[PDB]
């Protein structure tokens, strides 16, 4: 059962009942201002930081759900009602949201009365532009009175909301004209402040919530909108607020526009006041007669609307399956983009309270937005190695906002420094420069110690050769890539961090995910040795991918498939000895992906058991069976109840690396059904059951061993949109970017008869047709090449700024 | 304008409206578990820690207030409404809330049906009890559907409220019999639940939030009860809640009972399951036993209706007034008991994050209930300089919980060294038992460097000599009991705390205040050290107080009043020089209790001023001027708009001691008029100004500069009981403990014809009856004790447990 539909033409999702499962909200902004919004208008804003500058007060975990917002009350003759349905939750007859790119519409309309309100942040603007529309469809005269509300946060959301001892009695505003300012703070150490204006002249206002709302009343129906009149009230301490309340006549057929700005202003410590306890409103004045006539507002529309545009034109697609054409070409990129901007800040799960995002996070995303974003995934990668330290480690955790890492969370965390230069020979194939290897880069944010690129990748690189574990696979530290394996923890008591308690040595403890991921990754670190010249260390470095190659093989098969690590007590991990968790996902992914077992068949074998064990309608698990108690030996892993997070849920994450070890072996038909069970628009027809938004990736989805199997949790924020656009962009469709030019390589199911994909690479269009005469699934017979035919599977480049059209026969 | 009525025959505050101007809170609970609890049946509670085991969940400033508690349905026909007319608010026929000494009663009645639910939690017991009583008063055969409903926490505050991307996958539930149990997390490390039940077969249960109450719906309809059925649901993740439901038959005159527990059990981790994934259940059998019948909860309120009875026993007043006497009997020490138990964790401004309490705060705290509590009072005293460092300096938050202070916070907070001599000095001369200072006390919570308590209070009195400022005075370092007050901050950063960001040597500010807290603290000090027979000691201290004193005169006198301190520029701070701030509260209160300018007509000069600039019709401002900018060289104390918190508003912590002051030149009018201005019972007739509970103490009320004028802020948490208490008990009715016994001195106002005071104190109750045949307000002409004649004004310590009559005339 579904409650909308996509609209592919203009690249939303409309929805078309109110009560949906859960509130699916959209992402408006793109550089500093940023706001939340749901398909009821909920959610709050807030300026580069939903922690230290959030600006709109929002209650996570609700009673009842997503209260709080931009809410407007349409009040006619004693009855009022909200166009969102919310919070009046009055019946309506028409209800439509529509959730777009960087925007969000929403219509309602009762008793002859229609509302449309537009919500987006225009680019280059530290404010939230409300354009709304009422419209008189009945057969009569009427008189209307409207009623606007936002509620103000105090500027640090964690003493918002645990501190009330001081700040309610810091609370300040003020009232000017049809613009209400909040100033919390602001005759003291904070020069910023807020405000919500309307473009036309208001009959009443309130800033004082008790006021507008009631004590014993809820935003349903305040007591001031219950009236009809606003009570003109003034804040002083407690909780502030912003309304506006406008009579409105509307003749028959006769429609009515206005316009509404949440703004942010900073100013200058020297011109923080025009005067005695009067707040300095140069800027806000300009912010508010920038958007103060709809014109203006719908050129910013358009502006907007081609900066979207623009950032999926890249890599265009277009096949028989509509549902594959649409994740591709427009929700699959846009997640990206979106989780580039937003990082892991703030969402409908996440609090907005953290202090930063996983330092793998940062370089793992980076595999997707690198051809939407080329020169500032560069700036990235070297602000991410300045946060690397001399010894070869890197923070855990990353910090956008202060460029550094966190001291406080700590370093040995042995997966990290090995996805720095899986990141940097991502940008490097999709760019081809090689600039980045020489530039100077601080160690540890210390400009004195600084070194090459390059050699911050040789550290990385012999970290994990600087710490082999008795098998000589890579140590493992706290932990792997899976933050809740932690094999030298061992916590006894609550309220105590698995990541960051660590009571074992580490000397024992090794993990073979990661030597996949070494042999994986320092293939591609052998060709930048042999870039640089450097042909001993070349040969070297060679000499300990084979040594660990071997390794593996000794002490990483089970016999049908990979094991996962060793525990303290020298164990195997991930084996059919144990009695739970006999096969995982995680060394599966990245062995075969490493092409360790591909002669033997021993890849084949693994990804057999994959599918017998770990496949289920919904996706794969992370490992079968699921723990049913807690292994202290372990970690967090087996903290959680069967079916959900890391105890065998489905992790749409690692289910992309399953999806390109499937195209290793040679199989496109298993590849793509594993792709279709985790798509967004794949499983749109079954909405009630997902209960998240149908348009994007989910960061976990229930296994088979809950009791919600198919419901999924933590969305819109998530590397499941990175790994999930290279498995289908890159190993199913064959388009590779690498080394020399573009490779030609897919791997797609038997059935199809062909498709094309235009791709832009290296400042120039590849218009790329896959043809299957003989429905095969991997192997390329004939290139061709602007009608000329090309030796092997790699497409020149030529850099030129035009369109060649690619021919390939399978 | 009043909502209830004080019922001083049941020691209860009778609320006749739900509607008061603010929710009117209550406190369960005397050990271990505590619960907070308002007059619509709101609030939470939790064991021993709001911040590490609350229990019950519930949103702080939230729309509609006070949403979230113990509540109860009653479904009739189609129609259901709430006993507390809350969260349903629809309209009762009769309505009653009763707030008693550790109960609260509360009754509605609607359509003839009459429900009645008493709140308790019992003596020694780890469970908060609700009997529920319903009653048929209509004249017809009834059916109804009784729904309860409470929403749990995750046992983690911070956590609960924050970390919504892993806890949204731990919420556990188990349903058996009538009981539903609370087990998130109990499978990895926490070895303790929670459990609701009733005491009688229900007809269906929810635990799942969505399923009771409904995503879209609040708690004023949920969907289970406006069906007017149970949806028996299991939660498993999200929001876990506890609900039952009984239909009942009611025929005309004919009623039930119900018991209803929310009860907390800890395991060993041994005995942590009864069997694979099934909780270990057999504490929580033994706790609903002993209660599951009506008898048994009427004995255990009888038994802790003793237990407030005997701690309130100490001190009682007969006189003809009605408002004081209620307040000095039962309400003023009712909040002392309440403060000690609760220190400053939880109440409905104290959100329950916090770690601890101010080290000053257990030591001013101590005189309100050392005479209630004398043996754990000792307990707290030594408690206190065992995390007293070695140089002779205290952590400034003091944690009950570790019974340890707080690093992170640190020290140099030059004023709480002096409070532990005055808390000692307190708890001996009320019991007379002088062993404290021969007990081996720990430095720092170092075992291998203790000394006697006695040597703990020598490094404090030295504390202020060794650290001296260029006048003399004692350097104020980071702050002063005043803590918004940081001469060495100098703070520009919004994000940094005024309190430990310090930017200055500290080597020049000194404060007056502790000038004439050193005078006064240390003439308890010189008698100390002549009870050791340190005679020499005796003579040095009493050396460098003099020196003190006339420092005092010399530089801490401004002509009319005392200066308040100086600060990094060695400028004179609370001077008439100041454009603001001329004059403060905190350097008038202390140097005329030090007995200083008494006979030069100093002191009176000072009082003088205090009532013409500081004075209001609702209490003393803390300074005059306020403050209207923003002054960095004096810290948060600027940072407040006019008339709240520190910035002139009324603290009524301080006005005891102008209080205490005015008894010292012998003015009882001015005294007992200051008294009656923050006596909860003398404004309970502006009930709708004050906004806050009528029977306790508020920290602070908005002063003469601020548009609310009168109303109160952070209620139920403060140092005010104690030292209000201190200040009519001790200074105006005359009842002072001194070393050599009980000491007779009250200060009256000259209309009284007399009082009567039954005082117990060190083993023998003393029934004192002061009579003023001639009308004045300080001299003592006579003291009889027992039909004999005595000389001075210290009475006879007997210790043989009988009464004694004593006769005073003035």
């Not at 409103?281 to 508010?288: F, T, V, W």
């Not at 110690?449 to 050769?465: G, I, N, P, Q």
């Amino acid at each position: 059962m579904e409650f909308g539909f996509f609209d592919d033409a203009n690249k939303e999702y409309v929805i078309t009942v109110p009560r949906t499962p859960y509130p699916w909200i959209n992402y408006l902004g793109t550089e500093n201002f940023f706001s939340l919004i749901s398909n009821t208008a909920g959610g709050y804003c807030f300026y580069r930081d939903a922690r230290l500058r959030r600006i709109t007060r929002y209650r996570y975990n609700n009673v009842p759900i997503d209260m709080g917002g931009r809410y407007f009350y349409i009040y006619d003759n004693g009855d009022f009602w909200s166009p969102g349905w919310s919070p009046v939750k009055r019946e309506l007859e028409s209800y439509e949201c529509r959730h777009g790119l960087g925007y969000t519409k929403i219509a309602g309309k009762r008793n002859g009365i229609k509302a449309e309100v537009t919500f987006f942040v225009p680019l280059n603007y530290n404010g939230e532009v409300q354009k709304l529309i009422l419209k008189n469809e009945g057969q009569d005269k009427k008189k209307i009175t409207l009623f606007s509300f936002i509620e103000f946060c105090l500027w640090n959301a964690y003493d918002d909301m645990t501190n009330f001892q001081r700040n309610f009695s810091t609370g300040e505003v003020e009232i000017e004209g049809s613009v209400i300012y909040h100033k919390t703070e602001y005759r003291e150490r904070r020069n910023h402040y807020a405000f919500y204006s309307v473009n036309a002249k208001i009959s009443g206002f309130d800033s004082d919530r008790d006021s507008f709302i009631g004590l014993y009343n809820g935003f349903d129906a305040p007591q001031a909108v219950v009236n009809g009149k606003s009570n003109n009230s003034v804040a002083d301490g407690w909780a502030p607020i912003a309304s506006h309340s406008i009579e409105i006549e509307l003749n028959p057929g006769e429609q009515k526009e206005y316009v509404f700005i949440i703004g942010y202003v900073e100013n200058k410590d020297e011109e923080k006041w025009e005067s005695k306890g009067v707040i300095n409103k140069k800027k806000a004045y300009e912010m508010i007669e920038q958007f103060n006539t709809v014109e203006k507002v719908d050129k910013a529309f358009e502006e907007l609307k081609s900066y979207w545009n623009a950032l999926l034109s890249k890599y265009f697609l277009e096949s028989h399956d509509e549902k594959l054409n649409r994740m591709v070409n427009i929700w699959n990129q846009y997640q990206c983009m979106v989780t580039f901007n937003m990082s892991r800040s703030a969402s409908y799960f996440e609090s907005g309270i953290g202090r930063g995002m996983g330092f793998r996070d940062s370089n793992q995303d980076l595999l997707g937005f690198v051809h939407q974003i080329p020169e500032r995934a560069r700036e990235r990668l070297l602000d991410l190695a300045a946060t690397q330290l001399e010894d070869g480690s890197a923070y855990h955790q990353y910090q956008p906002l202060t460029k550094k890492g966190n001291n406080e969370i700590g370093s040995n965390f042995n997966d990290d420094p090995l996805w720095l230069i899986l990141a940097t020979a991502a940008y490097i194939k999709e760019t081809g420069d090689y600039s980045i290897l020489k530039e100077q880069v601080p160690f540890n944010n210390d400009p004195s110690k600084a070194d090459t690129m390059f050699e911050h990748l040789t550290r990385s690189f012999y970290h994990v050769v600087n710490n082999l574990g008795p098998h000589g696979l890579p140590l493992i530290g706290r932990a792997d890539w899976n933050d809740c394996l932690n094999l030298n923890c061992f916590s006894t008591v609550p309220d105590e961090s698995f990541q960051t308690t660590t009571s074992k040595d580490g000397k024992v403890a090794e993990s073979v995910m990661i030597a996949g991921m070494f042999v994986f990754i320092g293939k591609d670190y052998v060709k930048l040795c042999e870039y640089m010249g450097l042909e001993e260390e070349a040969r070297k470095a060679q000499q300990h991918i084979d040594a660990m190659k071997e390794a593996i093989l000794k002490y990483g098969y089970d016999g049908e498939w990979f094991l996962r690590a060793y525990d303290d007590f020298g164990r195997k991990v991930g084996s059919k000895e144990n009695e739970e968790g006999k096969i995982f996902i995680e060394s599966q992914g990245f062995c075969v992906m490493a092409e360790i077992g591909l002669e033997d068949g021993k890849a084949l074998k693994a990804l057999d058991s994959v599918k017998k064990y770990l496949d289920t309608p919904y996706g794969l698990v992370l490992q079968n069976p699921a723990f049913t108690r807690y292994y202290i030996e372990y970690g967090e892993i087996s903290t959680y109840p069967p079916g959900y997070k890391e105890n065998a849920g489905i992790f749409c994450h690692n289910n992309a690396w399953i999806i390109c070890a499937e195209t290793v072996v040679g199989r496109g038909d298993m590849a793509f059904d594993y792709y279709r069970k985790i798509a967004p628009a794949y499983i749109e027809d079954v909405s009630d059951i997902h209960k998240l938004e149908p348009y994007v990736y989910a960061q976990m989805v229930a296994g088979k061993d809950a009791k919600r199997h198919g419901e999924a949790k933590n969305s819109w924020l998530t590397g499941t949109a990175a790994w999930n656009f290279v498995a289908i962009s890159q190993w199913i469709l064959g388009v590779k970017p690498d080394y020399d030019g573009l490779k030609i390589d897919p791997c797609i199911p038997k059935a199809w008869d062909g498709y094309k994909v235009t791709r832009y690479f290296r400042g120039s269009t590849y218009e790329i047709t896959v043809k299957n005469p003989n429905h095969v699934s991997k192997g390329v017979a004939k290139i061709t090449v602007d009608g000329n035919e090309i030796s092997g599977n790699i497409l020149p480049v030529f850099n030129d700024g035009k369109t060649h059209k690619v021919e390939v026969i399978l």
